[PDB]
């Protein structure tokens, strides 16, 4: 499926997915690695910049991560990558067909555990060597010894002993010999998550019932136990600041803090990550610092801090509840409709089924922000009609943006799914605009466009009506009536003279806009789903229902090129910056590259995940695709 | 941040360090008894004479102050400044003075404690260093002129920001502004950790322990709207009242009844929490006057909740414990009181527990019902249990006399429960 | 007295002076190689120096009606208002209503 024109750059807008992030320490600073599917990332912990992404995609999903100081140990399907600066410097292949569930590092050893209850040991070939490379031996656990492996932990000060926690009980393996030096007793609950403690000889345990069990290894007994109502514990961490604190992360989105000295909870966080996507998959107090880092599966990563106590003399009793600090955000859901913001390819609007539009940044990946949804108080004085429990806007299916008059009034018009109006957005202030645009014939908004001057806002109703609202005041100026079925695309030319529209009745109507006269009217065969105008050359392309792209000259009022070759519905398409190409993506899981002079495809890309939108840059450099599965935006580098 | 923010942070850490003479004549001049001109002209040697002479009078009132003359009020403890000593030694000076202000706070109307703490004010700088335990020990004397003096010295902590308009004011801090203190969620977490520290030494006095609850009632009162605010409030208040029932003192236990009954009427607690609270009221209930208050809790606690399982039988460990501390004759003398409180929803849970557990004394179970006019659903919910008991128990003539009370009143109610379960002729055939 | 004993943890003999960090473990300048039982003893005491022992691990362990019955049930619940009941009695001052 190797293309000749495009090649993937990276996927924009993803932070986490559910795999537990693992932190590493450089000197006194901290870096967070996460993963995104088949390609992991690295975040600083002091300002959450993006520092390193991996050089190649892995052949499958990364299942587990860990990081010792410079070297990030990534574990996809059968193999374990030992990565430095995102560069694969040594690939370590495990000799089974089983998939690796969990991973651990201590000393000279690496400890990888496949899913069929088997643990592989990899030794440093030399103590000078930094990454362990040589296969030492294969440790197994039969099911009479313990259950399925929950995790691998190595506790503090144990010479080659490996605390293997299972769903039933807890083991210990001296990896130099290979022998089970100690087995624990069987637990009444299914264990879900284990974590060590900054005290000696204690690992913490987490069950499917809400019970945290402190467990000693020198005594082999349960020292303390903490019951939690109605929660499946998914993450554990201890604050190492000098104040005893346990952080229990549920799978119902709750994060719960305890004070083991006072035997009390302190403050419980509610819904810091979505319950449905997995809740708090991993939470970790950074070492010796009052910073806990929470990363759920809903494509976010947040840091919470403890302020110092307000009490002078008391201190450890009056504890400030935790506090929101910096975070990074992505779409939890796949993106429905995107666009580019400006000419230098510096921002991308992306609206998804999460109902929250985002202005991602191709340039610097810490610059991406959710556009706010906080309604302007009306000019008129009567109050705004809406539910008092604020819910997000319905998901966005059509967006239009002309960048010519930015910072002075609105320049983004979005049409929400199944709403008789269609809102506006300011680009510079990152906010919903003050005007909302109605259709005045009770039809749903299926297509919007803006004038190049940025003064007129087109709205194509699903009952033919093309209302043209002005963009200072949101006032109504003109209402065009040619179509009878749903209008599915409007445009205005570069000169603000002529205007086109396309309906599901097949009519492609050509308007004058200076005068209000209908210039002409063209009828094609099939209904017409979408339109992309190209204002530099007055060519526009249609997507029909007979699975062909028809390109029509806007001046001479006739079909110039017709493109056959697709085999299912054409999702979206876009012209090149110079009008020399059309790249269309369809439900045949292909992405083709049409060539307008010679009238044929010159490159056919079979992607397994179907591509919903394809948008060129206004600059001649980047190509952005959004697929059906996955959350982020695939960016293609242009070899042309 | 800026420069002057960081450079005023050094000023707080050296608030007591006398550097210039003018710095000393501002710090030493403030005190409890002497005015600002006559305070600056006297030695520590002068103040120690008046303190150690006064402290021996307090040792006569109670012998507990005799120990502090060995350590804090001793003659060798004039040369020691706080600032010279290490960090471990200062926390012991705090833990002596924190142990001192517990014993001092009770005898605070008396003149000798005013001359006693002043040397511990002026030599040991407690009006700067530890003014939480200075103010929390003396937070109940807000109307008095001695607390008005205590305000006229202290740089107030960040938690006591409600009183900050009453520092060096004419009139005393009024009663509502004391509530605005306790309305904060953080200032309560001191006054828990002050009280659980104060109970462990078993020196909690009557006027103090009133003013605790008389604020803790009002905090529930000012937050009776915001159901979110109350939801985060009872890890603070009920954990006191749990530890306030563990006290040996009968006077501390009655304070737990005032907070429990007030919070239970303001927020419908769960069934398991009320049964939890009813055990701890039962468990440490020894003296006479604590028992009367304790019975009006369970009288009132069972009426606060309402739902499915409202009138459930009491658990086994609960009931015999309630029979242990409350007598079945003493509960009858309780119902014959002409106060006659609403005992309505509890006794129909009490009577059913008799019917299942004990069963030896159903003479009482008649005489319970003559004394209280019950509710409509309660009598049906009782009579279902006795008809279950009628089949199971080895049949007894006093059980027949119980139904004769219900043949007297609400005859159709006896029929409709029998027409729900069993036969009409079979019950009269059974007896 | 521990619950387990590793036999080959005594036989192992580690040189201290190789790595830059472990040279703080030695007691005198003359020693260079320490067996595994004393090495893991010394490595615990440095692990004391990095993380001091808190109060809850050592002194405290979990191992008529009681007095702590009110504290325990407060620990085992997180939401205190009886919303689970479906009471069929209407709560005052707060009316759950949804406009259609």
């Amino acid at each position: 499926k190797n293309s000749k024109i495009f090649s993937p750059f990276r996927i924009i807008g993803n932070v986490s997915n559910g795999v537990p992030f693992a932190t590493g320490t450089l000197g006194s600073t901290f870096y967070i690695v996460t993963c995104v599917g088949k390609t992991f990332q690295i975040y600083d912990a002091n300002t959450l910049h993006l520092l390193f992404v991996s050089e190649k995609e892995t052949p499958s999903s990364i299942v587990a991560l860990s990081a010792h100081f410079h070297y990030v140990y990534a574990a996809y399907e059968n193999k374990v990558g030992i990565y430095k600066r995102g560069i694969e410097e040594h690939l370590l292949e495990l000799e089974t067909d089983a998939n690796v569930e969990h991973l651990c590092i201590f000393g000279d050893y690496l400890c990888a555990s496949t899913d069929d209850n088997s643990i592989f040991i990899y030794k440093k070939s030399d103590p000078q060597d930094k990454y362990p490379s040589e296969f030492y031996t294969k440790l197994t656990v039969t099911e009479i010894q313990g259950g399925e492996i929950v995790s691998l932990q190595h506790l503090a000060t144990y010479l080659n002993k490996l605390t293997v926690v299972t769903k039933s009980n807890v083991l210990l393996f001296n990896v130099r010999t290979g022998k089970l030096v100690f087995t624990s007793n069987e637990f009444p609950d299914q264990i879900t998550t284990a974590e060590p403690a900054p005290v000696l000889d204690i690992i913490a345990l987490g069950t499917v019932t809400g019970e945290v069990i402190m467990f000693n290894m020198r005594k082999g007994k349960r020292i303390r136990t903490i019951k939690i109502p109605q929660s499946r514990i998914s993450s554990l961490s201890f604050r190492t600041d000098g104040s005893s604190h346990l952080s229990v992360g549920t799978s119902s989105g709750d994060l719960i803090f305890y004070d083991l000295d006072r035997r009390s909870r302190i403050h419980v966080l509610k819904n810091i990550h979505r319950e449905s996507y997995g809740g708090v998959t991993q939470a970790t107090f950074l070492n010796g610092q009052p910073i806990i880092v929470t990363s759920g599966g809903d494509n976010s990563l947040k840091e919470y801090v403890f302020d110092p106590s307000l009490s002078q003399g008391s201190g450890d009793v009056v504890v400030q509840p935790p506090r929101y600090l910096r975070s990074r955000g992505g779409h939890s859901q796949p993106p429905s409709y995107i666009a580019f913001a400006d000419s230098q390819s510096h921002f991308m609007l992306s609206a998804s089924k999460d109902r929250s539009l985002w202005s991602f940044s191709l340039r610097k990946d810490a610059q991406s922000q959710e556009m706010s949804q906080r309604l302007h108080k009306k000019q008129d004085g009567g109050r705004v009609g809406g539910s008092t429990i604020k819910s997000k806007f319905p998901e966005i299916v059509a967006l239009a943006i002309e960048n010519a008059r930015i910072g002075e009034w609105e320049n983004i018009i979005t049409a929400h799914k199944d709403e008789k109006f269609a809102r506006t957005w300011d680009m510079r202030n990152k906010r919903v605009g003050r005007w909302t645009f109605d259709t005045t014939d009770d039809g749903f908004v299926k297509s919007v466009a803006m004038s190049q001057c940025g003064n007129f806002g087109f709205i194509g109703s699903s009952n033919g009506s093309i209302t043209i609202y002005n963009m200072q005041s949101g006032i109504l100026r003109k209402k065009y009536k040619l179509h009878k079925r749903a209008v599915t695309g409007i445009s205005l030319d570069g000169m603000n003279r002529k205007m086109v529209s396309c309906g599901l009745d097949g009519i492609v109507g050509f308007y004058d806009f200076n005068k209000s006269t209908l210039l002409g009217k063209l009828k094609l065969d099939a209904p017409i789903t979408a339109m992309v105008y190209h204002r530099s050359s007055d060519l526009f392309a249609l997507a029909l229902d007979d699975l062909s792209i028809v390109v029509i000259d806007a001046v001479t009022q006739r079909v110039v090129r017709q493109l056959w070759g697709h085999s299912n519905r054409i999702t979206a398409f876009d012209f090149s910056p110079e009008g020399r190409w059309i790249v269309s993506a369809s439900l045949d899981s292909t992405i083709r590259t049409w060539d307008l002079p010679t009238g044929g495809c010159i490159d056919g890309i079979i992607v397994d995940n179907v591509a919903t939108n394809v948008k060129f840059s206004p600059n001649g450099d980047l190509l952005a695709t959004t697929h059906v599965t996955g959350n982020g935006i695939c960016i293609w580098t242009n070899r042309a | 941040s800026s420069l002057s923010d960081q450079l005023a942070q050094v000023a707080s850490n050296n608030a007591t360090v006398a550097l210039d003479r003018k710095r000393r004549q501002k710090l030493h001049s403030a005190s409890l008894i002497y005015n600002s001109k006559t305070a600056a002209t006297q030695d520590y040697d002068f103040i120690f004479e008046n303190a150690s002479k006064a402290l021996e009078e307090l040792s006569q009132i109670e012998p507990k102050f005799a120990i502090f003359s060995r350590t804090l009020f001793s003659e060798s403890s004039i040369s020691l400044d706080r600032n010279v000593q290490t960090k471990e030694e200062i926390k012991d000076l705090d833990n002596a003075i924190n142990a001192y202000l517990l014993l001092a706070s009770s005898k605070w109307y008396l003149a000798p404690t005013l001359h006693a703490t002043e040397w511990l004010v002026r030599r040991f700088q407690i009006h700067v260093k530890n003014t939480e335990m200075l103010l929390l020990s003396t937070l109940n004397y807000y109307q008095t002129p001695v607390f008005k003096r205590i305000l006229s010295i202290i740089k107030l902590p960040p938690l006591f920001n409600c009183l900050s308009n009453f520092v060096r004011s004419e009139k005393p801090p009024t009663a509502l502004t004391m509530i605005k203190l306790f309305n904060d969620m953080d200032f309560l977490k001191l006054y828990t950790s002050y009280l659980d520290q104060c109970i462990k030494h078993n020196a909690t006095y009557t006027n103090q322990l009133l003013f605790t609850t008389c604020c803790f009632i009002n905090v529930v009162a000012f937050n009776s709207n915001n159901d979110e605010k109350l939801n985060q409030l009872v890890p603070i208040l009920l954990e006191i009242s749990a530890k306030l029932l563990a006290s040996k003192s009968k006077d501390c236990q009655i304070a737990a009844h005032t907070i429990l009954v007030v919070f239970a009427t303001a927020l419908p607690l769960k069934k398991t929490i009320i049964l939890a609270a009813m055990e701890t009221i039962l468990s440490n209930l020894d003296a006479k006057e604590a028992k009367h208050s304790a019975l009006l809790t369970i009288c009132k606690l069972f009426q606060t909740l309402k739902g499915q399982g409202n009138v459930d039988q009491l658990p086994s460990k609960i009931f015999k414990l309630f029979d242990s501390k409350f007598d079945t004759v003493s509960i009858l003398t309780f119902l014959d009181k002409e106060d006659k409180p609403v005992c309505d929803k509890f006794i129909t849970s009490y009577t059913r527990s008799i019917a299942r557990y004990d069963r030896s004394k159903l003479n009482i179970i008649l005489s319970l019902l003559k004394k209280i006019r019950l509710e409509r659903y309660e009598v049906r919910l009782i009579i279902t249990d006795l008809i279950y008991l009628s089949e199971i128990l080895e049949d007894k003539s006093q059980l027949v006399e119980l139904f004769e009370y219900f043949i007297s009143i609400n005859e159709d109610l006896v029929l409709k429960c029998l027409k729900s379960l069993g036969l009409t002729g079979x019950x009269x055939x059974x007896x | 007295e521990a619950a387990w004993i590793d036999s080959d943890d005594e036989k192992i003999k580690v040189p201290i002076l190789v790595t830059n960090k472990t040279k703080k473990l030695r007691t005198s300048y003359n020693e260079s190689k320490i067996n595994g039982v004393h090495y893991i003893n010394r490595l615990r005491s440095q692990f004391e120096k990095i993380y001091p022992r808190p109060k809850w691990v050592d002194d405290e362990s979990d191992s008529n009606g009681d007095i702590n019955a009110l504290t325990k049930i407060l620990s085992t619940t997180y939401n205190y208002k009886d919303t689970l009941s479906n009471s069929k009695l209407l709560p005052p001052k707060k009316l759950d209503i949804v406009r259609l």
Partner: peptide, 28 residues
């Protein structure tokens, strides 16, 4: 005035960890 709750600027102080990489000793 109520208790002035103001978040303070948080600097990461330095700390240290027990290295697990020293916990392995060679064969005898």
């Amino acid at each position: 005035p109520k208790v002035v709750r103001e978040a303070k600027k948080v600097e990461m102080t330095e700390a240290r960890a027990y290295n697990a990489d020293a916990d392995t000793a060679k064969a005898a």
